[PDB]
């Protein structure tokens, strides 16, 4: 009766559900946009932009 | 006015780094099939170094 799951869950803090970003997903996609800020900062890769 | 400054470098570091197959036909593969050819001409070669 257990069922492994790739990713995390917490489970219901409220059960009035509201926005936070403190989650893995979100942290995921700001860590890729972090790295996609740091390639446009990089000047040596494109100096034609 | 700094625009195709930037353009021209861009272009230039694109058109470096386009891709084609052409030169590592030239090094590996041409030589190769020119060779296997060679043999079968009716004006054999003749060469100058």
Same mark, same amino acid.
């Given at each position: 009766?257990?069922?492994?799951?790739?990713?995390?869950?917490?489970?219901?803090? #409220?059960?009035?559900?509201?926005?936070?970003?403190?989650?893995?997903?979100?942290? $995921?996609?700001?860590? #890729?946009?972090?790295?996609?800020?740091?390639?446009?900062?990089?000047?040596?890769?494109?100096?034609? $932009? | %006015?700094?625009?195709?400054?930037?353009?021209?470098?861009? %272009? +230039?570091?694109? +058109?470096?780094?386009?891709?084609?197959? %052409?030169?590592?036909?030239?090094?590996?593969? &041409? *030589?190769?099939?020119? &060779?296997?050819? &060679? *043999?079968?001409? *009716?004006?054999? *070669?003749?060469?100058?170094?």
């Amino acid at each position: 009766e257990v069922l492994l799951l790739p990713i995390d869950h917490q489970p219901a803090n #409220v059960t009035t559900p509201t926005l936070d970003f403190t989650n893995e997903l979100t942290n $995921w996609r700001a860590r #890729v946009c972090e790295l996609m800020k740091n390639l446009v900062d990089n000047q040596r890769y494109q100096p034609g $932009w | %006015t700094q625009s195709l400054v930037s353009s021209m470098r861009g %272009t +230039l570091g694109k +058109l470096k780094l386009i891709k084609s197959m %052409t030169p590592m036909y030239l090094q590996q593969l &041409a *030589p190769v099939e020119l &060779a296997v050819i &060679a *043999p079968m001409l *009716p004006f054999p *070669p003749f060469q100058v170094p």
